[PDB]
Structures are given as structure tokens and as C-alpha cells.
């Protein structure tokens, strides 16, 4: 399961690669770049840029992405509720990153679902597959979880294959 997961996610990163690299080319904000590096499933360069842009704590936090530590998951979500109940202002991309640490980035109450309009469906699916709750789910039911949140274009065949894969039963 781990092997298969790693190959799938390396491949998705192969596909979304240029899209995101373009987006990083045009960003004017460092924390957003850090997020985009997480979009390429590159935890280390996110951590590094964080470090460099003087965002050190975040940097540490980032290092958890891809270990599925449920403690960290519920803590990140907690921080998010506390902000989303008062929290006079939190940077738009730090909240996104915390939402990634929460393990349920659309399935949620600070939801990245609106990124539906800014990214390839495959890009977001990468987010579910990499963070998302890898251990608790089978590859199939995980992918299915994601698909349940987003309609794919009828005509797109790589979409179709994911649907047939997730459809299992």
C-alpha cells in the first residue's frame, strides 16, 4: 500500500508540476509560495523557504506533513476553530497550511474547496492523497473520499480511471 501510494503521488506531482511552478513564478508573497511547494508535495523546500522568509515555527510545523500523526491533526484543527471564532485576523495562507495539517482540507470548516476554481482537480486530489489521512484509509476509499467532494469533468479520462479505481465495490 505504501509503495503504490508513493508512486501514485510522485506521478500526480509529475503532472501538476508545471501548473504549480508557473503559479510560484507569479506569486508576490512568500507564505503563498510555501503553500505551493506543499502543492508539489515538497515538504522540504516549504520548510526551507519558511526558514528563509523567517517563518520558522511554521517551518517546524511543515515537517509533519506526510506523517499522519493524529495528535497534530486534532491540534491543527483546534487552532483553526479558535481562529474561526474571534481570531481577529490570520494570514490567508497560514490558515491554508494549518488546514493541510488538519488532514481534511476540503472535508472541513476552513475549507480549501474554493481552490476548486484556482487549481487542476488533480492538484487538489494530490492534497487529499498526500495529507488527507493516508494510514486510516485504503488508497481506494481515500480517493473516493476526495471524489465525493468534487465532480470531475465527464469527458476527462484520467478522471475516469480514478473513479473506476475508487469505485472498487
Amino acid at each position: 500500500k505504501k509503495e503504490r501510494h508513493c508512486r501514485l503521488t510522485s506521478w500526480i506531482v509529475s503532472q501538476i508540476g508545471p501548473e504549480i511552478e508557473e503559479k510560484i513564478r507569479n506569486s508576490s508573497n512568500e507564505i503563498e509560495q510555501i503553500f505551493l511547494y506543499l502543492l508539489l508535495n515538497d515538504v522540504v523546500r516549504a520548510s526551507k523557504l519558511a526558514i528563509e522568509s523567517k517563518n520558522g515555527h511554521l517551518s517546524v510545523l511543515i515537517s509533519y506533513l506526510g506523517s499522519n500523526d493524529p495528535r497534530i491533526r486534532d491540534l491543527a484543527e483546534l487552532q483553526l476553530q479558535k481562529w474561526s471564532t474571534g481570531g481577529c485576523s490570520i494570514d490567508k495562507n497560514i490558515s491554508k497550511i494549518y488546514k493541510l495539517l488538519s488532514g481534511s482540507p476540503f472535508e472541513g470548516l476552513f475549507s480549501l474547496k474554493e481552490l476548486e476554481s484556482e487549481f487542476s482537480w488533480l492538484c487538489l486530489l494530490n492534497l487529499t492523497l498526500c495529507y488527507g489521512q493516508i494510514d486510516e484509509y485504503s488508497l481506494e476509499s481515500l480517493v473516493q473520499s476526495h471524489l465525493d467532494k468534487f465532480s470531475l469533468p465527464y469527458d476527462d479520462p484520467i478522471g475516469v480511471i480514478f473513479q473506476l479505481y475508487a469505485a472498487n465495490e
Binding site: 508557473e22 508576490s28 495528535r71 486534532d74 483546534l78 476553530q81 479558535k82 471564532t85 476548486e116 469533468p153
Partner: protein, 742 residues
């Protein structure tokens, strides 16, 4: 960014993906940055091209609709929202928007009506829904009135709608009806708490006083309406002080003082006179609260002088006697007036104390120095600008005679609080404040009595404890809840001032003391219980409550720090151990044992200096300020074993209870040992029965006497033991007198 940053990125992805389809699929992400660079004729064409290839994306379609909204092209913007909505039905906010825009542009077509109906069922009775209902009608006077009335039938607690009724009355210049409804509505407990409503109440009344209709009609009911103005002023003052800024609050005081001066001249012995009495107290109390607000921001020299000044104000208020309740026409009116009286004595009371704890008999000095008429001018000076005429200002003309200068008694304070729980509609703000004010006192508040005053006939413990469905909510759950809310609140404020007294803040001045999560829960369970929920929102409210139940009962994934559980356990034991009835004793002891049984596994891991698994978004914030230490573990294990024994005794396992009680030589174990030895004696003491048994029966009564004496002997010697008594010292002595006369 600039124009160059975004138009240079054109060549960035143009050199990465050059085919027309991928060039157009980047249009949304191209348009994403032109919306940020203030380019709307350009951003429009970028998104519109992505829509040419990705015609089924609800996000892109909405984004163009939101962009056509900035362009004010209603026909185009609406259509865009429609497409995003028909693609994805979960976009409720867009169903409102469509309904919102259709009614603003043109109502002639029924399509605007249709979308408004859907918007209503997606947001049951929201504030915007009526707004749209009025907009659709706008496109005649009698017609508007019927809408408001039909709307008020099912939504009598809506602030905005009732305001509109007064405005419609005022538009037809039938002000008598405006005040009439205004008066009958001052009985509504919800509206009385609405800042904007009370503001409307103050105006519609004044307008009627000056109105030609008020004089012509008669001078008999003139007094009646005049009472409501003062009441409105009091409520409006309470609210303005909390939300509004320093300037606005002070300004409201001048209108209040003008009204008081204009009213005192009439006097008499009726509701108006009685109202003036109670409202007079409120004035100083709020004025004192107002004073303390200014000093908080100000320097230390002004603080002491202002707090000195405020202490006098609260004192004046507290002194004011309980208003003559019998003297009012109706049951509703008199109960209201008394409710406010309790609120005055309670709020001013705790303030008087918290300010007097600063120094020794600090209160005496305040009176001896500022009770002088010189203080009256120093009060008018600090509060108001001296330019205003000091003759018609009530503050400058009041006869400050024989200030009691007697600090309040706790027992009196408790009954003031309990009677004023319904003063501010039981807002968790109100209770969390009181709970904190009692956090510094040696006597604890009757929370269980507060909740009984709020949710009547809500069982102490629900039979169906197995599930967390919120039909099984119990006064214990609430009691357990408020305890955490206050235990949490105290720690949060303690942390705040440490970075920078917390007790000294008056109730209006301080901000939210609980987390919006906690407040949302209390407001939900309150609306649910009191039957003022919404058929549509019933399921949502119900689930909102359900979410937290499993934590109040320490079930799966409870966000409870071990210290808070222990606090719950002991706080319920001692709360229950002092109760008289068995039903209540059993329940509170049961829950206490329950929470204990959940902590001890944690304490054992903590006993060996290990780490506790921290929570995920807990309901009650964790703190290392009160993290349990090994120094206190053995005590809790002991204090818990008592709670176990107590429940064993109440259930019938006397043999094991005594065996446990006797193992630990604690003052509390004596009162339990004594109380259960006395019962075994009293029942068998006088019926015809074996003489040998009678001697054994007397022998128990002899043990009772001894244990009560050990309590008093150890009690009189040391003060720390007096505080450990599970019941009052005088109660222990009371039993002993009867025990020995037996």
C-alpha cells in the same frame, strides 16, 4: 504587484503550456491576479475564456458573476450565479444572492418571487429574509402594515421587525399606538436586551411627550408611558456601556440624568414613583461602572481617584432599598421591577466588595472622605463637562443622606444573584461573570439554583444517559458546563494579565469571557429548552448541542484537562455531600465518582512523570498553569477514595464504606462516619426489640457523639480544617445538640 507582474506571467505559462486548450484552461488562474490588480474589463475576458473550455466549473461561473456584480450588470451577474447554483446545489449563499438581486432590480416577474421562497427555506427566518420580503413589496401603507403584523405573529422576538412597526406607526403619526406597542413590548425579555430596540424605545417615547397628541388626549396615562422611558434608559445604559465607546456611554448618562431631574418633581406613591426609586440606583451603579471604564485606560492616580469615586456610586446604588413591588398594577410589571432590583444589588454588590478587598475597611474611607458634598461636585466634574447647567442635573441635586457604609453580606448577595439570573436573559456572559466574581470569595454560589431558575423542570440527571442526544440534557450537564466555562475563563484572563485586577472589572466593561464555541452552545441549548428555536434550525441547534454532550460527560474524545475533571469531581462531591435529599446526593455523588473514575488512569500515568496525550481542538482550553503535579496526586487518590466511599454508603455498601472511611483520618470522613452511625442508631433506638441489640444500638449513637466532637475539637483549633468541613460548622454542632439529648 502591478500591471507588469501579471502581464509578464503571460509569457511565463505561455512558455510552459502553449496549446489553445491549456492556454484557455489557465484563464481562471490568469483572471485570478487581474481581479487583484484592479483590472475588470481584462479579468472579465480572462475568466470568460476559461469558461469557454471549463463551462461546468461552479467556482469560475460564480467568480464572473461576482465580477459582473462589481460591474453592476445585474442581468449578467444574476445569470452567472444561476449557472454556478444549478451546477452545485450546496451553494446556499448564492441562492440568497439571486433572490437578493432579483428583488432589488425588478419585481414585476414572478421569478423574483420564486427565488425568494427558496432563499427563505434555506435560511429559516433569517434577518435578510424579511428584508427581501419588504423589498419585494416596495415596488400601500395598509399593505406594508399587514406584512409586519403577519411577520410579527411568528417572529415576535425579531428586533428589526418590531422596530419597523414603531416606524410605521410613526409614519402615520399615530404615536399613541407606537408607544402602546412599545409599552406592551417592554415586557418581552428578549427585546429589553436589544440595544437598537431600546434606542428606538427612547425616541418614540420622547416624540410622544412633545407630541401634540400626548397633551390633547389626557394627563392620566402620561405617568404610565413616562415610567417606560426610565426603564428603557436603564436597559439602554447597560448595553451602551458594554458595546459602545467611552464617548457614547457618557453622552447617554446626560439624557438619563435629565430624565431623572424632570421626573422627581412629580413624586407620588405609584408605579412611576417606585420606578424612579429603582432606576435611581441603576443610575449610580452604571455611573460607577462608567467611571471605572475611563480609569482603566487612564493612569494610576486617576484610577484610584476614579475607583474611589466609583466605589461611592456603587455604594449609593446598593443602599437604595428594594422597590415597593406590591404597588404595581400587574404581576408581570412587578416581577420585572424586582428582577432589576436583584440585578442592581448583585452587580453593585460584587463591585463594592472587589473594590473593598484592596485595602482594610477601604469602604469606610470612601464615605468619610467623599460622602461630603465636595464629592458630589468632584463626581459631576469627572463625569460631565462643567459647562452644562448644574441645576437641572439630577446628579448635582440628589440628597446623599446617611450612606450605610456597610459592606454586603454574602448570604444576601447569593439571593440577589439567584433572583437576577434572568436579568440579562441568562447570557453565558452574565453567569460566567458571576461565577468569576464568586471565584475570589470564601462562599460558593448556588449554581444548581441558578439553573433551576432558568430551565424549570429540567431533570437533575436524565434516565437515558446512554446516548448523547440533546433531549437528555440535564441540569448536571449545565452545572458541569458552567464550571468549566468559569474554570477556563479564569485561566485565560490569568494568562492575559500575566503578559500585561481581573476580578475588579465590572460586567459591562469586560469583553467576552468565554469562547465563541461555548457561547454558541449555551445560546443553542437555551433557545432549544425555552422553545424559542426555529423549525428549520431545530435540527442544526439540536446537533450543535449534541456535539458537546460527549465532553460534558467525559465520553469518547473529551477535550478535558485532568485538572478540570478533578475540579468537576470534587466540586460535585462537596456540592452533593451538603445536600439533604438522597436523590440529589446520589446523582451528584454518582457524577463525581464518574469523573473520578476517568481521571485516575491519567493520574497514574502522571504519577510516574509521563506525558498526557494532548487534545484535538478541545472544548475547554488546556493550560500548563494548572497541570497536575506529583505533589498533589496522592491527595486526589485519597479525596477520590472518599467520593467512592460516600457513594458506596448511599447505595448500601455500608461495610465497605466504613472500612474505607476509617482508613483515612479526615475531617470529612468523620461527618460521613458520624452521619451513617447516627442512622443505624436512630431507627433501632426506641422500638421493642432484643435488649442485647438495644445495647448495640446505643453503642453506635455513642460513636456518633465522639466523631462529631472530634470534628469540633479539630475545627476550633485550626482554620484550614474549618474550610474542609463538608457542611457548615454550625450544622455539625446543631446535630450534636440533638445527638446528645437523644
Amino acid at each position: 504587484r502591478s500591471k507588469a507582474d501579471v502581464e509578464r506571467y503571460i509569457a511565463s505559462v505561455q512558455g510552459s503550456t502553449p496549446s489553445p486548450r491549456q492556454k484557455s484552461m489557465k484563464g481562471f488562474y490568469f483572471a485570478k491576479l487581474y481581479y487583484e490588480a484592479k483590472e475588470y474589463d481584462l479579468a472579465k475576458k480572462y475568466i470568460c475564456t476559461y469558461i469557454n473550455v471549463q463551462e461546468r466549473d461552479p467556482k469560475a461561473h460564480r467568480f464572473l458573476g461576482l465580477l459582473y456584480e462589481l460591474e453592476e450588470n445585474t442581468d449578467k451577474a444574476v445569470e452567472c450565479y444561476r449557472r454556478s447554483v444549478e451546477l452545485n446545489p450546496t451553494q446556499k449563499d448564492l441562492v440568497l444572492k439571486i433572490a437578493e438581486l432579483l428583488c432589488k432590480n425588478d419585481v414585476t416577474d414572478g421569478r423574483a418571487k420564486y427565488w425568494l421562497e427558496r432563499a427563505a427555506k434555506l435560511f429559516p427566518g433569517s434577518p435578510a429574509i424579511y428584508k427581501l420580503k419588504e423589498q419585494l413589496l416596495d415596488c400601500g401603507w395598509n399593505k406594508l402594515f399587514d406584512l409586519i403584523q403577519s411577520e410579527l405573529y411568528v417572529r415576535p422576538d425579531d428586533v428589526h421587525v418590531n422596530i419597523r412597526l414603531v416606524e410605521v406607526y410613526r409614519s402615520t403619526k399615530r404615536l399613541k399606538d407606537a408607544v402602546a406597542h412599545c409599552h406592551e413590548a417592554e415586557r418581552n425579555i428578549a427585546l429589553r436586551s436589544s440595544l437598537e430596540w431600546n434606542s428606538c424605545v427612547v425616541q418614540t417615547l420622547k416624540e410622544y411627550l412633545e407630541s401634540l397628541q400626548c397633551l390633547e388626549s389626557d394627563k392620566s396615562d402620561w405617568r404610565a408611558t413616562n415610567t417606560d422611558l426610565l426603564l428603557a434608559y436603564a436597559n439602554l445604559m447597560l448595553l451602551t456601556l458594554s458595546t459602545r465607546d467611552v464617548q457614547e456611554s457618557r453622552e447617554l448618562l446626560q439624557s438619563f440624568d435629565s430624565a431623572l431631574q424632570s421626573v422627581k418633581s412629580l413624586g407620588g406613591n405609584d408605579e412611576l414613583s417606585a420606578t424612579f426609586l429603582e432606576m435611581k440606583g441603576h443610575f449610580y451603579m452604571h455611573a460607577g461602572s462608567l467611571l471605572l471604564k475611563m480609569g482603566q485606560h487612564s493612569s494610576n492616580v486617576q484610577w484610584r481617584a476614579l475607583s474611589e469615586l466609583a466605589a461611592l456610586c456603587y455604594l449609593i446604588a446598593f443602599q437604595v432599598p428594594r422597590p415597593k413591588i406590591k404597588l404595581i398594577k400587574g404581576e408581570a410589571g412587578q416581577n420585572l421591577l424586582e428582577m432589576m432590583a436583584c440585578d442592581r444589588l448583585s452587580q453593585s454588590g460584587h463591585m463594592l466588595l472587589n473594590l473593598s478587598r484592596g485595602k482594610q475597611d477601604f469602604l469606610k474611607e470612601i464615605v468619610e472622605t467623599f460622602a461630603n458634598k465636595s464629592g458630589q461636585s468632584a463626581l459631576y466634574d469627572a463625569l460631565f463637562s462643567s459647562q452644562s447647567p448644574k441645576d437641572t442635573s439630577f446628579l448635582g441635586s440628589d440628597d446623599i443622606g446617611n450612606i450605610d457604609v456597610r459592606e454586603p453580606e454574602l448570604e444576601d448577595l447569593t439571593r440577589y444573584d439567584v433572583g437576577a439570573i434572568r436579568a440579562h436573559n441568562g447570557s453565558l456572559q452574565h453567569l460566567t461573570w458571576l461565577g468569576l466574581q464568586w471565584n475570589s470569595l470564601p462562599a460558593l454560589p448556588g449554581i444548581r439554583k441558578w439553573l433551576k431558575q432558568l430551565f424549570h423542570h429540567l431533570p437533575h440527571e436524565t434516565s437515558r444517559l446512554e446516548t448523547n442526544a440533546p433531549e437528555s440534557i440535564c441540569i448536571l450537564d449545565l452545572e458541569v458546563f458552567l464550571l468549566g466555562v468559569v474554570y477556563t475563563s479564569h485561566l485565560q484572563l490569568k494568562e492575559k494579565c500575566n503578559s500585561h485586577q481581573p476580578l475588579c472589572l465590572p460586567l459591562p466593561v469586560c469583553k467576552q469571557l468565554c469562547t465563541e464555541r461555548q457561547k454558541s452552545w449555551w445560546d443553542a441549548v437555551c433557545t432549544l429548552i425555552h422553545r424559542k428555536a426555529v423549525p428549520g434550525n431545530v435540527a442544526k441547534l439540536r446537533l450543535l448541542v449534541q456535539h458537546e454532550i460527549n465532553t460534558l460527560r467525559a465520553q469518547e474524545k473529551h477535550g478535558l484537562q485532568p485538572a478540570l475533571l478533578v475540579h468537576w469531581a470534587e466540586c460535585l462531591q462537596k456540592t452533593g455531600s451538603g445536600l439533604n435529599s438522597f436523590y440529589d446526593q446520589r446523582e451528584y455523588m454518582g457524577r463525581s465518582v464518574h469523573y473520578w473514575k476517568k481521571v485516575l488512569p491519567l493520574l497514574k500515568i502522571i504519577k510516574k512523570k509521563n506525558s498526557i496525550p494532548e487534545p484535538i481542538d478541545p472544548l475547554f482550553k488546556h493550560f500548563h498553569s494548572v497541570d497536575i503535579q506529583a505533589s498533589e496526586i496522592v491527595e486526589y487518590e485519597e479525596d477520590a477514595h472518599i467520593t467512592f466511599a460516600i457513594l458506596d454508603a448511599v447505595n448500601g455498601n455500608i461495610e465497605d464504606a466504613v472500612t474505607a472511611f476509617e482508613s483515612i483520618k479526615s475531617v470529612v470522613s468523620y461527618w460521613n462516619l458520624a452521619l451513617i452511625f447516627h442512622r443505624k442508631a436512630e431507627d433501632i433506638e426506641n422500638d421493642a426489640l432484643s435488649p442485647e441489640e438495644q445495647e448495640e444500638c446505643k453503642n453506635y449513637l455513642r460513636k456518633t457523639r465522639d466523631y462529631l466532637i472530634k470534628i469540633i475539637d479539630d475545627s476550633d483549633s485550626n482554620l484550614s480544617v474549618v474550610k474542609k468541613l463538608p457542611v457548615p460548622l454550625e450544622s455539625v454542632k446543631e446535630m450534636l445538640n440533638s445527638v446528645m439529648q437523644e
